[PDB]
Amino acid sequence: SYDSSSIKVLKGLDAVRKRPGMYIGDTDDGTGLHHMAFEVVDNAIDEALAGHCKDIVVTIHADNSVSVTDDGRGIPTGIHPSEGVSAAEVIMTVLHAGGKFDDNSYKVSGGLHGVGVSVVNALSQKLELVIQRDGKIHRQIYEHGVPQAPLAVTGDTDKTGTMVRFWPSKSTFTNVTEFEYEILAKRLRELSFLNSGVSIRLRDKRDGKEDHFHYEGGIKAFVEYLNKNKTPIHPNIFYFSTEKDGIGVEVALQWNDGFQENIYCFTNNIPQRDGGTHLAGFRAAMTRTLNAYMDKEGYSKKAKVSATGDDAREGLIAVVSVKVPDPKFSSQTKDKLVSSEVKSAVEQQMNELLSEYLLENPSDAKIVVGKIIDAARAREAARRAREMTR
Amino acid sequence: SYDSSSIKVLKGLDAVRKRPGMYIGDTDDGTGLHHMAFEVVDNAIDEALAGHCKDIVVTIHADNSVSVTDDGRGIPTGIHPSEGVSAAEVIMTVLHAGGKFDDNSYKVSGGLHGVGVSVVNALSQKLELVIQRDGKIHRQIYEHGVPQAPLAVTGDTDKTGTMVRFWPSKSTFTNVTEFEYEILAKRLRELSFLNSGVSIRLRDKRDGKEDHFHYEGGIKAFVEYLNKNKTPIHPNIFYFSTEKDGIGVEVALQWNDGFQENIYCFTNNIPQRDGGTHLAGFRAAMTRTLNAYMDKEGYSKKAKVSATGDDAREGLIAVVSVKVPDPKFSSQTKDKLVSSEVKSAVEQQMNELLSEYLLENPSDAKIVVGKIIDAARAREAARRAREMTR
Ligand SMILES: Nc1ncnc2c1ncn2[C@@H]1O[C@H](COP(=O)(O)OP(=O)(O)OP(=O)(O)O)[C@@H](O)[C@H]1O
Ligand SMILES: Nc1ncnc2c1ncn2[C@@H]1O[C@H](COP(=O)(O)OP(=O)(O)OP(=O)(O)O)[C@@H](O)[C@H]1O
Ligand SMILES: [Cl-]
Ligand SMILES: [Cl-]
């Protein structure tokens, strides 16, 4: 019964169709379905990070396919010297294949696994690829990840870029099978905030809805946008952008009247829903700096006796965006940043620049200290009241 | 600059060494390092789920290597008809290779990707494999995932099983590089609770510390163990074990005096730290059943006016353990169960059996209702007290 013949080797993209949970995620609640679009978008954003793409158009078609057009360099079209087919076909049909295993093509990229669009292809009943590169238009069609013919020159062009349109496999995706405008818009808005000078257009051909994301203000405007329907309690958004020992750190924050903590973390524009070394550095610095400031200004009595890290973060909105040549995550999902050097990179910058901010904006600083004290008092009233019910 | 020659294909286990975050996880905080041991253990547990292994020995050696010995069937030793080397070498050296892509060798298995021990091998500067199978002892040594010679017969035996000892690569693992007794013990204890009749031994050859996990009581004893140092508020642990439409559902729960909710979810013995369809079914049923009971017993006035799902779960300890022929997760980490059929499987069983439990144990039922009401009152006192500080 259990012998050498029980041992099965999945080849090509078969492994992706066998276990889509491993590659695209939840194939049932819609998160995976939208992640098919995000893999293609993230590849275009990487062209932008590299300085080669200023213009991205995402289109929800009336047949529930999605296309992503960029004006970046184009997916390489040349025959791959080892694989014997176009570099484009290698990218589409081979796991762990791409230009983000070194710093030669992208200095900084959210991509690192070499599986993103090979996974989109595998789980798409159809993919259309159109490449503008080296004065030529290249076209290729895939069905369930199988190329219908070699990548072929169809025209001349003086432009560069990539168009991928994919029809998600109805065999793979279940329950939530239709693209939701607002799920795509949330991520493209945030990418606009993170990539000033990149025009991102979202077009819905089902109902003619259109958006053009080209936000003024970067992550400063991002924090203003996030605090819109909260009541910001101080007018000076804390902001900085630094680069040291090859690490980009960009931070913006502002407190509001509410009781939530919302710190949005990013590595090469990829969100970390479970934080990591950038959040850990941000937190250490915020605590050290606020505690140092409160001690120096004599306000420490409450902070010294009770006020803690948690109560600093009550009503906090912040964006922490880092640029890392070779990031490490805790998993394939890239939801937690592991790169240990990023923690001191964020921590030393925040320590210096948040200290300066509090000296340069004493009105803001007194309001934030007020906020910290009020959050401690509420926390202690609540603990006391739970005890009294017993 | 950016052309077909920029496109690199990682072959064999190179992809695992290039991006260990994708395969083993955090290579810096120790979680990944311990996960190397858990991949090998989980493979032995799968032999147990299949009915073929009653005995597992995990050993921390004084050189910081780890071995896992099972008395299961043995890794197949026969030449693989396609790959041309031993099935064992295929398992060790090929991603997406194994016997858990169908229900022929394991009816139910935590394994499903075919990468677990191929990843351990890749990130081990040395791995020793010893297989007892078909009356023969088979031995093979790997260095950095490269076999030093073909799997070779070295002896006769009337026994079956697998021994893997691995020396983690000092190039891959950083900061936390030493195995922690207690991290391994926590998981082997829980596996003992989940697998009655499987003897699990943990041996530390650094200090001679030994444990033998062969717990009496299954997940009932698991819940008793978890409530030890809390104050259980009712003596009748709710418990059931069912099998319907090919899904095993096993639940045990008991309330304590504390304010935490702790629901430990498992699929084929793999933990879901982020829950999924089993937790969602458990929650729906618990809410429907408690609400139905409170309404019928007339206690509903508080529950109807205020008491909510959250306050049911305050002071709750529970274990939800499901057995699923072909599970689907939201990611490679297997931390969230996606299989949608599991939600109604857990929900219908809990609805019926928790209803019966509350009718059959009216003293417990009145205490749990008391608990639910008290948690609402504390929640409302706390909200009120936060408002009054403003
Ligand atoms: N829009 C694009 N323009 C140019 N090159 C692209 C584009 N999309 C993909 N590529 C190339 O194809 C390669 C493979 O992309 P794929 O998404 O499969 O993996 P990756 O982006 O390298 O990593 P990840 O799996 O983390 O996304 C990229 O590394 C890049 O070299
Ligand atoms: N201790 C063992 N005894 C018997 N067969 C084993 C043992 N360990 C591994 N195998 C075999 O080797 C195969 C490959 O194991 P591996 O851990 O690489 O992947 P998997 O267990 O199939 O899935 P996953 O990647 O989710 O762990 C298993 O499917 C099984 O057939
Ligand atoms: Cl065999
Ligand atoms: Cl090229």
PDB file of N, CA, C and O in Angstrom, chain A residues 306 311 314 373-389, chain B residues 377-390:
ATOM      1  N   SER A 306       2.002  55.903  36.215  1.00  0.00           N
ATOM      2  CA  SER A 306       1.006  55.010  35.553  1.00  0.00           C
ATOM      3  C   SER A 306       1.139  54.949  34.025  1.00  0.00           C
ATOM      4  O   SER A 306       1.220  53.815  33.523  1.00  0.00           O
ATOM      5  N   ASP A 311      -1.105  53.530  26.259  1.00  0.00           N
ATOM      6  CA  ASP A 311      -1.875  54.800  26.376  1.00  0.00           C
ATOM      7  C   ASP A 311      -1.251  55.889  25.475  1.00  0.00           C
ATOM      8  O   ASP A 311      -2.022  56.714  24.987  1.00  0.00           O
ATOM      9  N   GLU A 314      -3.136  55.185  22.132  1.00  0.00           N
ATOM     10  CA  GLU A 314      -4.602  55.421  22.049  1.00  0.00           C
ATOM     11  C   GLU A 314      -4.862  56.690  21.203  1.00  0.00           C
ATOM     12  O   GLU A 314      -4.263  57.736  21.499  1.00  0.00           O
ATOM     13  N   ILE A 373      -2.109  61.195  29.318  1.00  0.00           N
ATOM     14  CA  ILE A 373      -2.648  61.276  30.707  1.00  0.00           C
ATOM     15  C   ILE A 373      -4.140  60.908  30.721  1.00  0.00           C
ATOM     16  O   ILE A 373      -4.541  60.085  31.565  1.00  0.00           O
ATOM     17  N   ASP A 374      -4.945  61.517  29.854  1.00  0.00           N
ATOM     18  CA  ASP A 374      -6.396  61.222  29.769  1.00  0.00           C
ATOM     19  C   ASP A 374      -6.614  59.732  29.509  1.00  0.00           C
ATOM     20  O   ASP A 374      -7.564  59.190  30.093  1.00  0.00           O
ATOM     21  N   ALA A 375      -5.800  59.091  28.661  1.00  0.00           N
ATOM     22  CA  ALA A 375      -5.969  57.663  28.285  1.00  0.00           C
ATOM     23  C   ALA A 375      -5.643  56.778  29.502  1.00  0.00           C
ATOM     24  O   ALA A 375      -6.363  55.798  29.734  1.00  0.00           O
ATOM     25  N   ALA A 376      -4.635  57.147  30.292  1.00  0.00           N
ATOM     26  CA  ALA A 376      -4.296  56.450  31.549  1.00  0.00           C
ATOM     27  C   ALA A 376      -5.485  56.549  32.518  1.00  0.00           C
ATOM     28  O   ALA A 376      -5.897  55.513  33.058  1.00  0.00           O
ATOM     29  N   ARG A 377      -6.039  57.747  32.702  1.00  0.00           N
ATOM     30  CA  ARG A 377      -7.145  57.996  33.654  1.00  0.00           C
ATOM     31  C   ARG A 377      -8.356  57.148  33.260  1.00  0.00           C
ATOM     32  O   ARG A 377      -8.952  56.558  34.146  1.00  0.00           O
ATOM     33  N   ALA A 378      -8.719  57.113  31.978  1.00  0.00           N
ATOM     34  CA  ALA A 378      -9.841  56.294  31.465  1.00  0.00           C
ATOM     35  C   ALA A 378      -9.572  54.802  31.739  1.00  0.00           C
ATOM     36  O   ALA A 378     -10.491  54.095  32.181  1.00  0.00           O
ATOM     37  N   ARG A 379      -8.352  54.346  31.461  1.00  0.00           N
ATOM     38  CA  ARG A 379      -7.904  52.936  31.624  1.00  0.00           C
ATOM     39  C   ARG A 379      -8.081  52.558  33.102  1.00  0.00           C
ATOM     40  O   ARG A 379      -8.644  51.491  33.353  1.00  0.00           O
ATOM     41  N   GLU A 380      -7.643  53.425  34.026  1.00  0.00           N
ATOM     42  CA  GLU A 380      -7.680  53.181  35.491  1.00  0.00           C
ATOM     43  C   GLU A 380      -9.135  53.261  35.986  1.00  0.00           C
ATOM     44  O   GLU A 380      -9.543  52.395  36.778  1.00  0.00           O
ATOM     45  N   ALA A 381      -9.932  54.220  35.525  1.00  0.00           N
ATOM     46  CA  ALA A 381     -11.373  54.265  35.869  1.00  0.00           C
ATOM     47  C   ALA A 381     -12.036  52.937  35.453  1.00  0.00           C
ATOM     48  O   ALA A 381     -12.877  52.446  36.209  1.00  0.00           O
ATOM     49  N   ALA A 382     -11.671  52.371  34.298  1.00  0.00           N
ATOM     50  CA  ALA A 382     -12.350  51.189  33.711  1.00  0.00           C
ATOM     51  C   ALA A 382     -11.989  49.945  34.530  1.00  0.00           C
ATOM     52  O   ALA A 382     -12.899  49.177  34.860  1.00  0.00           O
ATOM     53  N   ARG A 383     -10.709  49.797  34.865  1.00  0.00           N
ATOM     54  CA  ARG A 383     -10.168  48.684  35.691  1.00  0.00           C
ATOM     55  C   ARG A 383     -10.893  48.695  37.043  1.00  0.00           C
ATOM     56  O   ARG A 383     -11.423  47.641  37.453  1.00  0.00           O
ATOM     57  N   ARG A 384     -10.956  49.871  37.667  1.00  0.00           N
ATOM     58  CA  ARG A 384     -11.610  50.109  38.974  1.00  0.00           C
ATOM     59  C   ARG A 384     -13.074  49.671  38.901  1.00  0.00           C
ATOM     60  O   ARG A 384     -13.547  49.042  39.841  1.00  0.00           O
ATOM     61  N   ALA A 385     -13.777  50.036  37.834  1.00  0.00           N
ATOM     62  CA  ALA A 385     -15.230  49.811  37.666  1.00  0.00           C
ATOM     63  C   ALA A 385     -15.507  48.312  37.450  1.00  0.00           C
ATOM     64  O   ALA A 385     -16.523  47.818  37.979  1.00  0.00           O
ATOM     65  N   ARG A 386     -14.636  47.612  36.716  1.00  0.00           N
ATOM     66  CA  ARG A 386     -14.737  46.142  36.524  1.00  0.00           C
ATOM     67  C   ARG A 386     -14.570  45.457  37.887  1.00  0.00           C
ATOM     68  O   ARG A 386     -15.355  44.538  38.165  1.00  0.00           O
ATOM     69  N   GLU A 387     -13.593  45.878  38.692  1.00  0.00           N
ATOM     70  CA  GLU A 387     -13.349  45.303  40.045  1.00  0.00           C
ATOM     71  C   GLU A 387     -14.604  45.457  40.912  1.00  0.00           C
ATOM     72  O   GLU A 387     -14.971  44.499  41.585  1.00  0.00           O
ATOM     73  N   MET A 388     -15.236  46.625  40.887  1.00  0.00           N
ATOM     74  CA  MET A 388     -16.382  46.964  41.767  1.00  0.00           C
ATOM     75  C   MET A 388     -17.611  46.112  41.417  1.00  0.00           C
ATOM     76  O   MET A 388     -18.392  45.850  42.341  1.00  0.00           O
ATOM     77  N   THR A 389     -17.784  45.665  40.166  1.00  0.00           N
ATOM     78  CA  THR A 389     -18.848  44.681  39.810  1.00  0.00           C
ATOM     79  C   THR A 389     -18.452  43.288  40.322  1.00  0.00           C
ATOM     80  O   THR A 389     -19.371  42.466  40.475  1.00  0.00           O
TER      81      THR A 389
ATOM     82  N   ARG B 377     -22.115  43.127  32.857  1.00  0.00           N
ATOM     83  CA  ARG B 377     -22.170  44.176  33.901  1.00  0.00           C
ATOM     84  C   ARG B 377     -20.799  44.846  34.021  1.00  0.00           C
ATOM     85  O   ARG B 377     -20.765  46.063  34.099  1.00  0.00           O
ATOM     86  N   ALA B 378     -19.714  44.073  34.061  1.00  0.00           N
ATOM     87  CA  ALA B 378     -18.333  44.602  34.128  1.00  0.00           C
ATOM     88  C   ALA B 378     -18.039  45.465  32.886  1.00  0.00           C
ATOM     89  O   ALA B 378     -17.461  46.553  33.030  1.00  0.00           O
ATOM     90  N   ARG B 379     -18.410  44.972  31.705  1.00  0.00           N
ATOM     91  CA  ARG B 379     -18.188  45.633  30.391  1.00  0.00           C
ATOM     92  C   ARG B 379     -18.893  46.997  30.428  1.00  0.00           C
ATOM     93  O   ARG B 379     -18.254  47.979  30.047  1.00  0.00           O
ATOM     94  N   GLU B 380     -20.145  47.040  30.904  1.00  0.00           N
ATOM     95  CA  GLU B 380     -20.986  48.265  30.948  1.00  0.00           C
ATOM     96  C   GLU B 380     -20.451  49.214  32.035  1.00  0.00           C
ATOM     97  O   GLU B 380     -20.351  50.424  31.772  1.00  0.00           O
ATOM     98  N   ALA B 381     -20.068  48.717  33.207  1.00  0.00           N
ATOM     99  CA  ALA B 381     -19.428  49.567  34.239  1.00  0.00           C
ATOM    100  C   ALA B 381     -18.174  50.235  33.640  1.00  0.00           C
ATOM    101  O   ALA B 381     -17.944  51.410  33.935  1.00  0.00           O
ATOM    102  N   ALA B 382     -17.392  49.520  32.824  1.00  0.00           N
ATOM    103  CA  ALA B 382     -16.079  49.992  32.320  1.00  0.00           C
ATOM    104  C   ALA B 382     -16.307  51.088  31.274  1.00  0.00           C
ATOM    105  O   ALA B 382     -15.635  52.122  31.353  1.00  0.00           O
ATOM    106  N   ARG B 383     -17.253  50.863  30.365  1.00  0.00           N
ATOM    107  CA  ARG B 383     -17.654  51.820  29.297  1.00  0.00           C
ATOM    108  C   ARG B 383     -18.106  53.123  29.968  1.00  0.00           C
ATOM    109  O   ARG B 383     -17.597  54.201  29.595  1.00  0.00           O
ATOM    110  N   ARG B 384     -18.984  52.999  30.963  1.00  0.00           N
ATOM    111  CA  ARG B 384     -19.548  54.122  31.747  1.00  0.00           C
ATOM    112  C   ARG B 384     -18.410  54.925  32.381  1.00  0.00           C
ATOM    113  O   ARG B 384     -18.469  56.149  32.356  1.00  0.00           O
ATOM    114  N   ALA B 385     -17.428  54.249  32.970  1.00  0.00           N
ATOM    115  CA  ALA B 385     -16.326  54.866  33.741  1.00  0.00           C
ATOM    116  C   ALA B 385     -15.369  55.605  32.788  1.00  0.00           C
ATOM    117  O   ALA B 385     -14.881  56.689  33.166  1.00  0.00           O
ATOM    118  N   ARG B 386     -15.120  55.052  31.596  1.00  0.00           N
ATOM    119  CA  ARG B 386     -14.300  55.719  30.551  1.00  0.00           C
ATOM    120  C   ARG B 386     -15.008  57.009  30.121  1.00  0.00           C
ATOM    121  O   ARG B 386     -14.314  58.029  29.998  1.00  0.00           O
ATOM    122  N   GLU B 387     -16.323  56.965  29.894  1.00  0.00           N
ATOM    123  CA  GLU B 387     -17.120  58.157  29.492  1.00  0.00           C
ATOM    124  C   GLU B 387     -16.986  59.257  30.553  1.00  0.00           C
ATOM    125  O   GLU B 387     -16.793  60.411  30.179  1.00  0.00           O
ATOM    126  N   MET B 388     -17.082  58.903  31.829  1.00  0.00           N
ATOM    127  CA  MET B 388     -17.103  59.869  32.956  1.00  0.00           C
ATOM    128  C   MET B 388     -15.749  60.581  33.092  1.00  0.00           C
ATOM    129  O   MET B 388     -15.766  61.735  33.539  1.00  0.00           O
ATOM    130  N   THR B 389     -14.624  59.965  32.706  1.00  0.00           N
ATOM    131  CA  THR B 389     -13.311  60.670  32.634  1.00  0.00           C
ATOM    132  C   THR B 389     -13.295  61.602  31.413  1.00  0.00           C
ATOM    133  O   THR B 389     -12.477  62.537  31.434  1.00  0.00           O
ATOM    134  N   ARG B 390     -14.118  61.282  30.398  1.00  0.00           N
ATOM    135  CA  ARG B 390     -14.476  62.032  29.146  1.00  0.00           C
ATOM    136  C   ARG B 390     -13.499  61.656  28.028  1.00  0.00           C
ATOM    137  O   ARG B 390     -13.791  60.624  27.387  1.00  0.00           O
TER     138      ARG B 390
END
